[PDB]
C-alpha cells in the first residue's frame, strides 16, 4: 500500500502505513523525491507504523510525505552485465555509462549457507609477500583480514594483493568500497582501466565495483557491503566461478550500524556500541564463504579505533576469519613496510601437514627468535647491549636481520618511495629465512637486508656497501 | 588619529543621548486618541488577516 | 548623516506579522528548548525565538519539537513564542563576506555594517561523489619551506595541523593565509585563492589579534573570519565549522579555489560533547558521542577537488587538533588522521629548542605528494627528503667516519635551512633556490649559525642583479644542468665575494 | 501605503530632534548626567593618552631637530 512519513530523526525515518505493513528489510521508495530515496524497514514499531533506515540523506523530508512499498527488499542487478560497472548501495550505476541492462536481480539480504554446504579444502594461495607467505599464509578460497590502524597501510596492502593475485586469477573479481575515501575509489577504477581488467569499449571485464563511501549517510554505509556480497554470491552459486571479493573496510559497516543504534531506541552496548553488533556481523560474514558450488577468496580490511585490538568490533571480527594480517603502528615507525606484526598474525593454514614441514619449522623459528628479541628489549632499553651475553647478541643480530628482511618493496608503493616492487616466490622466501636462521649471513650488515626481495638482493646489496 | 577619535567619540555620545531622548519622548508621545486609533488599526489588520484564510 | 541611517534602519525593520505558525516553549534549560506546536515544521529547520535568538529544530517528536538554541539560554523563558522560518539551517555566502568577521550564523561582529549577500547556502550539504571528483594536481603554497618541500599540500587536499598547545599551529595557518597575497594580487585568476578562518573556542582577544595581523598584512581582503569564541554557546561553536565550510563551498562550486582552516576542531568536538551530554545521549570513548567521527567526516568530505565539468573548483581544508602530551593515539586525532590525506605534526621538544616551525619530518607525511608540487620544487625536495632520511639514520646511532660526519653536517645545515621566521612566507622561487643551495653542498663551508644571514643576503643578491636567473627559472619551470652549472658558479662567486 | 503608526511616529520624533538640534546648534539635547560623565572621562583619557595636555593637538605641532654629535673620526 501507501504510507506517510511520521518522523525523521537523523537517518532514521518512521513511516505509518494505512492498510498493510511492509515486511522487515523491505525497500520503500519515497514519493516526490528526485534522486530515489530508498528506506529499508528495520522494525515494526506498532500501531501500523514502521521504522526505516534511509539509504541516502533525509534532508528535505516533510512529515506526511508519501512513501510507496515496493513489495520486495533492495534488489540489485547481478550477472555478467555488472562487470566493469560501478554501483551504489541500491545497485544503481554511478559510473555514468548508462543503465545496467540485465535480466537477473537478487536481494541484498539472503540467508547464510547451511552446515552441509561447506568445503574443508585448504590450499595455499601464494601472494608474493614474504611476511604473508611465511608466517600467516593465505588459502585458496577463504577469509583474509588485514587489521590496521590509521595510516599504517591497508589500502597499499589491498592494492598489492589485487596486483599480485587478481590480475593473474582468471575467474572473476568484485571490489566493495565501504566507507573509505572516494579518491581511493577513483584511483582504483582508473587503475583497473589502465591494467585492462575493465574494458570500457567491449566485454571481458573481470571486476565489478560497488562503492558506498564515508561521505554517505550511515544507512548507506551499513548495506553496501551486502551489495558487494550479493554480486559475489551470484558469481559463486549461479555461475560456479572462482570469485575474488575485496572489501575496504568492514569496520565502516559495523560503525555505521552503531551510528543508527541510538536513533533506533536501543540500549547501547559496552563502550557505546550497538547491542546487536555480534549478530549483525555474524549474519553478514557467514554469507562470505567457499561453498561446494563455487569458491570465494575474500580479503577484507579492518580498522582498529585508537589503535586498540580489544575494541569489540575487531574482537568480534577476529573469530570470523581464516587468515589474519595485523598491522602495527610501532613497526611502521621503524620504517618496516609492510608493517605486519609477526607475533600477532595467524592463518590456521600454518600447519606442518598443509604447507610443508620445512615451511612450518622456518616460520616457527622466526617467531621464536622475534619473541626472544621482544623479551630482551626490556633489558636492552636500560642496560644496553653490553650486559647481554654472546647468545643474546646473536639473537638480537639475527632478529634485526629477520625484521629487515620481512620488509619488502611493493609495486603499488613505488610512487611513495621509488624502490622497484619485488615479487618474491615462496621457495625463495623459505630459502632466505633458512639462510638467516642458520647463521650463514651473520657477516653481513643489517641495512643490506632492508627493502630487498630475495636473498640474492641481500648479498648484492651487502657487496655494494 | 586624535581628531578621528574625538569625532567618533562625540558622534557615539550624540547617538547615545539621541536614542535615550527618543525612547523617553516616545514613552511621552502616547495620547488616548492615538491609542484608540492604533487599536482600531490593529483590529483592522487582524480582520484583514482573518480574510486571508 | 546619522538621521539618514536611522531612517534606513527604521524603514528596513518591517515586522510583517502575518500568518506565522508558531509554538510555545514548554521548558528551557541546558541549551535545548522543547516547543509545543509547529506541526508543519521540517527537520533541521531554522526557527526564531521571541527574544531574537535563532535555533535549529533537531528532534521531531510527536508532542513536541526539540530545538538547539544558537545563543545563551537566559534570554528564553517558559512560554515564549517560537516562529518557524521555513528554511533548513543556512548561512549567507558570497564575495560580500570577504574582509568580514562574522559569527557562526553569519551576523557580522566587526561593526562594519550589514553584509550585502545575495545568496544563502545550507550547512548540511552532502559531499561530491566519485565522478565529480578528479585527482589533486594543483599546488597549495603555504609559504613555509618545510611544508612546501617535505609535506606538500595540494588544492582540494585535507591536511591536518596537529600538535600540543603553544607549538605554532595557528602561526602556520595564518602564514598560509598571508602567503596567498602574491597570487591574489596577480592577474592569473586560476591561481587566486580565497581563505576562510574559523575560530572555535578561542579567546576573543586572540581572534582580535589575528584579525589585526591579517589587516596589517592586507590578507583580510580575501579572508572571511568565522568567530565562535570561548564565551559563546556550545551550539555556536558546533555550527561555525559548517558555516565556514558553506562559505568555502560557495567558491568551490563556482570554479574558484578556497582554503579553509578550522582552529581548532578539538574545541568543536568538546562543544559537541557538551551538547550531547546535555541531550542525555550515551557517551562512548572519553565520554564522547559515537557520531563525532561522522561530525568531522561530513565536515571534511566537503573539501575536495572538483572535475572540469563541475567548474574545476576546489576546497582545501587545514583542520587543527590540539593534543595532550603529544599523544596521537587519542580518539579525535586518530579520527581526523583517518579522514584527512596527511598531517603536519608539531613537536613541543623542537619548539623548546628554538626550531620554528617545529615540524616533525618523520611523522608528517602527505599522501598526494608529487602531484601537489611544481617540477623544480619536487626535483629538489626528493634529494632533500633522501638526505634528511640519511641524516636521521646516521644521527640515531651517533649519540667517526668522514662520510658519516659529512652526512651529519649536511643534515644539520638542512635543518637550520628549513627554519623560518613567523609571518614572513616566501615565494616558491625563493624556496626552490634556498633548498637548491642547501642540497647541492653550497653550504658546506658555511657555519650553521650564519645560514639565515646567508639566506637573506643571497635572496637580496638574486633580487638585485640576477633577475635573468629568475626569468630563466620561470620560463623553464625547472633547473636544467646548464642552469645548474651557472647557479653553482654564481653561488661560488657570491660566497667568495662575501668573504675572501 | 500601509505605513505603521509607530514607524511614522518614530520618524516624526527623529525629525523633531533634528530640528531641535539645529535650533540648539548641534549641541547635546537633554543628555543624562552619566553619559556626560563618561564622555568627559573618555575625552580626558584620550587627551592623556595622545598627549593633549602637553600641547594643543588641534593645531600644527612644531618640531626641533636634535643636534647630532657624530662618532669621533679621530682616535
Ligand atoms: N608498503 C609500503 N611502502 C611504503 N610506504 C607505505 C607502505 N604501506 C604504507 N605506507 C605508508 O603509509 C601510508 C598509509 O597508507 P594507507 O593509506 O594504505 O593506510 P591505511 O591503513 O589504509 O590508512 P587509513 O585507515 O587512514 O585508510 C602511505 O601513504 C605510505 O606513506
Ligand atoms: N615560526 C615562528 N617563529 C617565531 N615565533 C613563532 C613561530 N611560530 C610560532 N611562534 C610563536 O610561538 C607562540 C605560539 O604560537 P601559536 O599561538 O601560533 O601556537 P598555537 O598552537 O596556536 O597555540 P595555542 O594552543 O595557544 O592556540 C607565539 O608567541 C608565536 O609568536
Ligand atoms: Mg586506507
Ligand atoms: Mg592556536
Tab-separated table of C-alpha atoms in Angstrom, chain A residues 82-338:
chain	number	residue	atom	x	y	z
A	82	UNK	CA	27.607	-5.885	-13.876
A	83	UNK	CA	31.291	-6.498	-14.664
A	84	UNK	CA	33.238	-3.308	-15.240
A	85	UNK	CA	30.388	-1.205	-13.834
A	86	UNK	CA	30.276	0.861	-10.642
A	87	UNK	CA	27.191	0.579	-8.436
A	88	UNK	CA	25.963	2.297	-5.293
A	89	UNK	CA	24.237	0.629	-2.322
A	90	UNK	CA	20.873	0.288	-4.109
A	91	UNK	CA	22.516	-1.117	-7.219
A	92	UNK	CA	22.102	1.931	-9.444
A	93	UNK	CA	25.014	2.554	-11.841
A	94	UNK	CA	27.168	5.511	-10.806
A	95	UNK	CA	29.889	5.319	-13.470
A	96	UNK	CA	27.855	7.389	-16.000
A	97	UNK	CA	27.855	4.691	-18.681
A	98	UNK	CA	24.106	4.102	-18.904
A	99	UNK	CA	21.823	1.641	-17.136
A	100	UNK	CA	22.891	-1.898	-16.318
A	101	UNK	CA	20.750	-3.856	-18.784
A	102	UNK	CA	20.410	-7.287	-17.195
A	103	UNK	CA	17.676	-9.852	-16.668
A	104	UNK	CA	18.798	-11.176	-13.265
A	105	UNK	CA	18.244	-9.408	-9.948
A	106	UNK	CA	18.889	-10.548	-6.403
A	107	UNK	CA	18.008	-9.298	-2.941
A	108	UNK	CA	20.894	-7.912	-0.887
A	109	UNK	CA	19.628	-9.857	2.148
A	110	UNK	CA	19.972	-13.634	1.956
A	111	UNK	CA	20.332	-16.473	4.423
A	112	UNK	CA	23.731	-17.996	5.091
A	113	UNK	CA	24.722	-21.326	3.510
A	114	UNK	CA	23.900	-24.313	5.693
A	115	UNK	CA	26.293	-26.575	7.605
A	116	UNK	CA	26.096	-29.236	4.880
A	117	UNK	CA	27.133	-26.741	2.173
A	118	UNK	CA	30.689	-26.466	3.476
A	119	UNK	CA	34.053	-27.289	1.931
A	120	UNK	CA	37.139	-28.077	4.003
A	121	UNK	CA	39.787	-27.764	1.278
A	122	UNK	CA	42.841	-25.776	2.421
A	123	UNK	CA	45.215	-24.974	-0.450
A	124	UNK	CA	47.811	-22.239	-0.022
A	125	UNK	CA	47.480	-19.076	-2.102
A	126	UNK	CA	50.893	-17.604	-2.908
A	127	UNK	CA	50.844	-13.815	-2.664
A	128	UNK	CA	54.496	-12.956	-3.282
A	129	UNK	CA	54.825	-11.231	0.106
A	130	UNK	CA	57.465	-12.723	2.393
A	131	UNK	CA	55.820	-11.922	5.731
A	132	UNK	CA	52.472	-13.168	4.398
A	133	UNK	CA	53.714	-16.280	2.600
A	134	UNK	CA	55.883	-17.337	5.568
A	135	UNK	CA	54.169	-16.503	8.847
A	136	UNK	CA	50.446	-16.248	8.003
A	137	UNK	CA	49.909	-17.856	4.584
A	138	UNK	CA	46.694	-17.313	2.657
A	139	UNK	CA	44.329	-20.050	1.489
A	140	UNK	CA	42.754	-20.515	-1.938
A	141	UNK	CA	39.150	-19.844	-1.015
A	142	UNK	CA	38.719	-18.373	2.421
A	143	UNK	CA	38.633	-15.234	4.502
A	144	UNK	CA	41.632	-12.918	4.896
A	145	UNK	CA	41.586	-9.936	7.221
A	146	UNK	CA	44.045	-7.030	7.177
A	147	UNK	CA	43.800	-5.394	10.608
A	148	UNK	CA	45.344	-1.952	10.898
A	149	UNK	CA	45.008	1.496	12.391
A	150	UNK	CA	45.126	4.967	10.886
A	151	UNK	CA	47.967	5.381	8.408
A	152	UNK	CA	49.714	2.042	8.974
A	153	UNK	CA	48.956	0.766	5.463
A	154	UNK	CA	45.939	-1.322	4.479
A	155	UNK	CA	44.941	0.227	1.163
A	156	UNK	CA	48.515	-0.315	-0.051
A	157	UNK	CA	48.317	-3.966	1.006
A	158	UNK	CA	44.887	-4.261	-0.648
A	159	UNK	CA	46.230	-2.839	-3.915
A	160	UNK	CA	49.301	-5.078	-3.741
A	161	UNK	CA	47.107	-8.158	-3.325
A	162	UNK	CA	44.953	-7.033	-6.269
A	163	UNK	CA	48.082	-6.521	-8.375
A	164	UNK	CA	49.631	-9.868	-7.399
A	165	UNK	CA	46.515	-12.096	-7.347
A	166	UNK	CA	43.546	-10.561	-9.158
A	167	UNK	CA	45.265	-9.896	-12.490
A	168	UNK	CA	46.630	-13.445	-12.786
A	169	UNK	CA	43.447	-15.044	-11.450
A	170	UNK	CA	41.216	-15.968	-14.375
A	171	UNK	CA	37.908	-16.386	-12.596
A	172	UNK	CA	36.317	-13.042	-11.608
A	173	UNK	CA	36.677	-10.203	-9.128
A	174	UNK	CA	34.441	-7.959	-7.027
A	175	UNK	CA	35.577	-4.856	-5.150
A	176	UNK	CA	33.403	-3.401	-2.382
A	177	UNK	CA	34.442	0.032	-1.162
A	178	UNK	CA	32.798	0.507	2.240
A	179	UNK	CA	33.172	3.872	3.961
A	180	UNK	CA	36.562	4.845	2.532
A	181	UNK	CA	37.928	7.762	0.536
A	182	UNK	CA	36.236	8.471	-2.792
A	183	UNK	CA	39.678	9.424	-4.111
A	184	UNK	CA	40.785	5.835	-3.475
A	185	UNK	CA	37.799	4.503	-5.405
A	186	UNK	CA	38.506	6.814	-8.335
A	187	UNK	CA	42.174	5.792	-8.345
A	188	UNK	CA	41.345	2.073	-8.201
A	189	UNK	CA	38.801	2.446	-11.010
A	190	UNK	CA	41.338	4.178	-13.254
A	191	UNK	CA	43.984	1.621	-12.260
A	192	UNK	CA	41.734	-1.218	-13.434
A	193	UNK	CA	41.086	0.749	-16.633
A	194	UNK	CA	44.810	1.058	-17.358
A	195	UNK	CA	45.635	-2.542	-16.412
A	196	UNK	CA	42.943	-3.916	-18.736
A	197	UNK	CA	40.825	-5.645	-16.083
A	198	UNK	CA	37.953	-3.301	-17.029
A	199	UNK	CA	37.153	-2.756	-20.707
A	200	UNK	CA	35.091	0.346	-21.450
A	201	UNK	CA	34.986	-0.485	-25.162
A	202	UNK	CA	33.796	-4.099	-25.068
A	203	UNK	CA	33.117	-7.103	-22.831
A	204	UNK	CA	35.518	-9.385	-20.899
A	205	UNK	CA	35.729	-7.175	-17.846
A	206	UNK	CA	36.699	-9.214	-14.815
A	207	UNK	CA	35.971	-6.953	-11.822
A	208	UNK	CA	32.691	-5.432	-10.649
A	209	UNK	CA	32.862	-2.462	-8.270
A	210	UNK	CA	30.350	-1.416	-5.606
A	211	UNK	CA	31.115	1.807	-3.737
A	212	UNK	CA	29.488	3.376	-0.715
A	213	UNK	CA	31.959	5.734	0.900
A	214	UNK	CA	32.452	7.815	4.035
A	215	UNK	CA	30.531	10.799	2.656
A	216	UNK	CA	27.399	8.631	2.516
A	217	UNK	CA	24.892	8.625	5.392
A	218	UNK	CA	25.208	5.759	7.905
A	219	UNK	CA	22.268	3.919	6.342
A	220	UNK	CA	24.108	3.615	3.033
A	221	UNK	CA	27.416	2.530	4.573
A	222	UNK	CA	25.714	-0.273	6.524
A	223	UNK	CA	24.323	-2.016	3.420
A	224	UNK	CA	26.858	-1.533	0.598
A	225	UNK	CA	28.916	-4.490	1.846
A	226	UNK	CA	25.822	-6.673	1.428
A	227	UNK	CA	25.507	-5.375	-2.143
A	228	UNK	CA	29.061	-6.478	-2.933
A	229	UNK	CA	28.337	-9.786	-1.204
A	230	UNK	CA	25.291	-10.249	-3.441
A	231	UNK	CA	27.393	-9.752	-6.572
A	232	UNK	CA	29.943	-12.284	-5.314
A	233	UNK	CA	27.234	-14.774	-4.268
A	234	UNK	CA	25.708	-14.711	-7.746
A	235	UNK	CA	29.130	-15.194	-9.320
A	236	UNK	CA	29.758	-18.137	-6.976
A	237	UNK	CA	26.443	-20.015	-6.905
A	238	UNK	CA	24.585	-19.330	-10.146
A	239	UNK	CA	27.750	-19.424	-12.277
A	240	UNK	CA	30.071	-21.782	-10.385
A	241	UNK	CA	33.080	-19.474	-10.734
A	242	UNK	CA	36.076	-18.615	-8.583
A	243	UNK	CA	35.441	-15.131	-7.197
A	244	UNK	CA	37.763	-12.625	-5.547
A	245	UNK	CA	35.958	-10.299	-3.135
A	246	UNK	CA	37.851	-7.301	-1.755
A	247	UNK	CA	36.186	-5.196	0.950
A	248	UNK	CA	37.648	-1.952	2.308
A	249	UNK	CA	36.684	-1.754	5.002
A	250	UNK	CA	34.494	-3.846	7.317
A	251	UNK	CA	34.732	-1.502	10.317
A	252	UNK	CA	32.830	1.196	8.426
A	253	UNK	CA	29.923	-1.247	8.078
A	254	UNK	CA	29.934	-2.112	11.775
A	255	UNK	CA	30.367	1.548	12.768
A	256	UNK	CA	27.531	2.775	10.553
A	257	UNK	CA	25.397	0.140	12.244
A	258	UNK	CA	26.296	1.697	15.597
A	259	UNK	CA	25.655	5.281	14.464
A	260	UNK	CA	21.956	4.499	13.935
A	261	UNK	CA	21.622	2.279	17.014
A	262	UNK	CA	20.882	5.180	19.367
A	263	UNK	CA	18.252	6.532	16.957
A	264	UNK	CA	16.516	3.122	16.911
A	265	UNK	CA	15.775	3.382	20.640
A	266	UNK	CA	18.246	0.683	21.683
A	267	UNK	CA	20.224	0.443	24.904
A	268	UNK	CA	23.907	0.924	23.976
A	269	UNK	CA	26.372	-1.908	24.496
A	270	UNK	CA	29.803	-1.654	26.129
A	271	UNK	CA	31.878	1.382	25.046
A	272	UNK	CA	28.729	2.801	23.436
A	273	UNK	CA	28.248	0.135	20.762
A	274	UNK	CA	25.157	-1.453	19.279
A	275	UNK	CA	23.894	-4.430	21.333
A	276	UNK	CA	23.442	-6.462	18.117
A	277	UNK	CA	26.971	-5.961	16.762
A	278	UNK	CA	27.953	-9.634	17.020
A	279	UNK	CA	24.769	-10.969	15.414
A	280	UNK	CA	24.782	-8.422	12.579
A	281	UNK	CA	28.444	-9.150	11.850
A	282	UNK	CA	27.723	-12.878	12.011
A	283	UNK	CA	24.868	-12.722	9.516
A	284	UNK	CA	26.979	-10.561	7.198
A	285	UNK	CA	30.184	-12.608	7.368
A	286	UNK	CA	28.606	-16.061	7.053
A	287	UNK	CA	27.420	-15.185	3.541
A	288	UNK	CA	31.074	-14.773	2.511
A	289	UNK	CA	32.190	-18.388	2.200
A	290	UNK	CA	33.518	-21.027	-0.161
A	291	UNK	CA	30.722	-23.465	-0.981
A	292	UNK	CA	30.544	-26.663	-2.994
A	293	UNK	CA	29.007	-24.704	-5.890
A	294	UNK	CA	31.881	-22.237	-6.121
A	295	UNK	CA	34.858	-20.660	-4.423
A	296	UNK	CA	35.265	-17.169	-2.966
A	297	UNK	CA	38.581	-15.774	-1.764
A	298	UNK	CA	37.802	-12.693	0.311
A	299	UNK	CA	40.233	-10.024	1.504
A	300	UNK	CA	38.748	-7.566	3.998
A	301	UNK	CA	40.415	-4.582	5.605
A	302	UNK	CA	39.576	-3.891	9.257
A	303	UNK	CA	40.150	-0.592	11.071
A	304	UNK	CA	41.025	-0.558	14.779
A	305	UNK	CA	39.810	2.626	16.532
A	306	UNK	CA	42.553	4.397	18.528
A	307	UNK	CA	44.987	1.530	17.751
A	308	UNK	CA	43.098	-0.829	20.071
A	309	UNK	CA	42.684	-4.565	19.481
A	310	UNK	CA	40.374	-5.170	22.465
A	311	UNK	CA	37.689	-2.967	20.909
A	312	UNK	CA	34.504	-5.064	20.480
A	313	UNK	CA	34.256	-4.656	16.693
A	314	UNK	CA	37.730	-6.035	15.769
A	315	UNK	CA	37.496	-8.575	18.605
A	316	UNK	CA	34.273	-9.859	17.049
A	317	UNK	CA	35.786	-9.854	13.553
A	318	UNK	CA	38.775	-11.967	14.657
A	319	UNK	CA	36.747	-15.172	15.101
A	320	UNK	CA	35.150	-14.913	11.631
A	321	UNK	CA	38.381	-15.109	9.609
A	322	UNK	CA	40.836	-17.761	8.449
A	323	UNK	CA	43.990	-15.693	7.870
A	324	UNK	CA	44.703	-12.531	9.865
A	325	UNK	CA	47.330	-9.912	8.989
A	326	UNK	CA	47.714	-7.468	11.878
A	327	UNK	CA	49.482	-4.210	11.033
A	328	UNK	CA	51.158	-2.280	13.850
A	329	UNK	CA	51.936	1.427	14.095
A	330	UNK	CA	55.173	0.793	16.008
A	331	UNK	CA	56.563	-1.313	13.160
A	332	UNK	CA	55.653	1.459	10.713
A	333	UNK	CA	57.535	3.913	12.943
A	334	UNK	CA	60.626	1.731	12.429
A	335	UNK	CA	60.379	2.076	8.644
A	336	UNK	CA	59.491	-1.581	8.030
A	337	UNK	CA	56.899	-1.858	5.257
A	338	UNK	CA	54.510	-3.702	5.231
